[PDB]
Amino acid sequence: MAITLPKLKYALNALSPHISEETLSFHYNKHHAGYVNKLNGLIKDTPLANKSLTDILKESTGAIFNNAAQIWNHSFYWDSMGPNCGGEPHGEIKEKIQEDFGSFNNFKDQFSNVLCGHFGSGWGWLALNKNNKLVILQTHDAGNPIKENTGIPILTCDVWEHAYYIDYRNDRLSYVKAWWNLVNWNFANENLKNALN
Amino acid sequence: MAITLPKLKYALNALSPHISEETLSFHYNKHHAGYVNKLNGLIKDTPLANKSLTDILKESTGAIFNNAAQIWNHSFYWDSMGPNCGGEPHGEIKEKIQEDFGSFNNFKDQFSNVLCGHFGSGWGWLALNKNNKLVILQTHDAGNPIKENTGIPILTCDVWEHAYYIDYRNDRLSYVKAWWNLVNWNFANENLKNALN
Ligand SMILES: [Mn+2]
Ligand SMILES: [Mn+2]
Numbered sequence: 001m002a003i004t005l006p007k008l009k010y011a012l013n014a015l016s017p018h019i020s021e022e023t024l025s026f027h028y029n030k031h032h033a034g035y036v037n038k039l040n041g042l043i044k045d046t047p048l049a050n051k052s053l054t055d056i057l058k059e060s061t062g063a064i065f066n067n068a069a070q071i072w073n074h075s076f077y078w079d080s081m082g083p084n085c086g087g088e089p090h091g092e093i094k095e096k097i098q099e100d101f102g103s104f105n106n107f108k109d110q111f112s113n114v115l116c117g118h119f120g121s122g123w124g125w126l127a128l129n130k131n132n133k134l135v136i137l138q139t140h141d142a143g144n145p146i147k148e149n150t151g152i153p154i155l156t157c158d159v160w161e162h163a164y165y166i167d168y169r170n171d172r173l174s175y176v177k178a179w180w181n182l183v184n185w186n187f188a189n190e191n192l193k194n195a196l197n
Numbered sequence: 198m199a200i201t202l203p204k205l206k207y208a209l210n211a212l213s214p215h216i217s218e219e220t221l222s223f224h225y226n227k228h229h230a231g232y233v234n235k236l237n238g239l240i241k242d243t244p245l246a247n248k249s250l251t252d253i254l255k256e257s258t259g260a261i262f263n264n265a266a267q268i269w270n271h272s273f274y275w276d277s278m279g280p281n282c283g284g285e286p287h288g289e290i291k292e293k294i295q296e297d298f299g300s301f302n303n304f305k306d307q308f309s310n311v312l313c314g315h316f317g318s319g320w321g322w323l324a325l326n327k328n329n330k331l332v333i334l335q336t337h338d339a340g341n342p343i344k345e346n347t348g349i350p351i352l353t354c355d356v357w358e359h360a361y362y363i364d365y366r367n368d369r370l371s372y373v374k375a376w377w378n379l380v381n382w383n384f385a386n387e388n389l390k391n392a393l394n
């Protein structure tokens with residue numbers, strides 16, 4: 001089985017007006033697909049040729065790692081959002097956030113601050129750390145908490161300029177605000193359950 | 198004198214269709230201006246408050262350096278381009294590129310390769326090294342050859358996504374091709390002459 005672009009769990013216009021169908025079209029069909037295509041080009045006729053994405057992520061370095069990790073990161077980004085989502089958390093993730101951050105609003109303010117403050121290309125993460133505490137992390141470029149052994153990812157938000165430039169230009173703040181309307185708490189709950197078990 | 202945004206030496210539509218009017222307006226009036234404004238905000242009421250950009254570049258770290266460096270980098274980028282420019286080099290820079298790269302075409306293909314393969318936010322540089330040889334360099338985020346002590350800058354091209362996303366989206370290759378129509382060989386000659394003297 002060749003490594004492939006996993007399917008979005010919703011339509012290309014499903015996140016609008018918060019993220020436009022045009023953005024998803026480029027972000028998914030050009031950027032995300034391109035990472036898959038480029039990785040497959042790089043590993044062809046190498047000892048990594050028949051490896052799974054998981055194996056590649058563990059073993060590889062350089063541009064091979066960068067493309068592989070971007071594939072994984074973008075799939076986690078799509079899964080971290082959806083239609084008829086956003087708002088206040090619910091379920092276990094509501095308990096866990098209010099516990100570890102005091103309140104949802106405290107978390108949301110800190111997470112927004114990190115997303116808005118990140119310099120250059122990268123990612124913001126909600127993750128569960130080794131002490132089973134929720135933490136906010138940020139990574140540069142293709143970095144993530146799995147590769148960096150800093151925690152188990154629960155949610156992520158992309159802050160590469162290509163994630164928002166079409167809809168928001170330089171106004172990353174407006175993008176981050178829009179993103180809270182999309183956050184998939186069901187995905188967070190599933191990741192949290194699996195992370196604790 | 199407070200640190201200020203240097204004036205552009207050309208109109209905001211002087212580089213179209215290679216770089217659009219809209220790109221210059223966001224890139225200069227929002228991004229570059231923003232680095233000036235953020236720098237000035239950060240040094241206010243600190244020991245760096247009344248320092249010049251030059252002083253701040255040699256002393257500072259973290260966000261302060263990032264903003265200061267980006268101010269310098271963008272000013273260098275605007276000066277590296279112009280209307281009625283582009284094409285084959287001329288003057289001393291022609292001789293120098295011919296010698297150090299064998300030909301203009303070899304330099305151009307290498308520099309294009311470096312500009313296109315750079316992962317994440319960054320810059321490509323033509324620079325004079327300590328052996329008075331021209332070299333191709335790349336830096337991440339706000340990095341530049343002065344800070345990194347790797348060479349004296351001659352020309353630069355911005356490859357942060359915001360430099361090209363408005364006009365080309367993910368197609369950095371088209372942006373890089375367009376940029377060769379803009380490269381200011383007169384600036385390259387002035388830089389090379391000051392660097393050798
Ligand atoms: Mn992305
Ligand atoms: Mn820029």
Ligand SMILES: [Zn+2]
Binds near residue numbers: 215283378
């Ligand atoms: Zn032209």
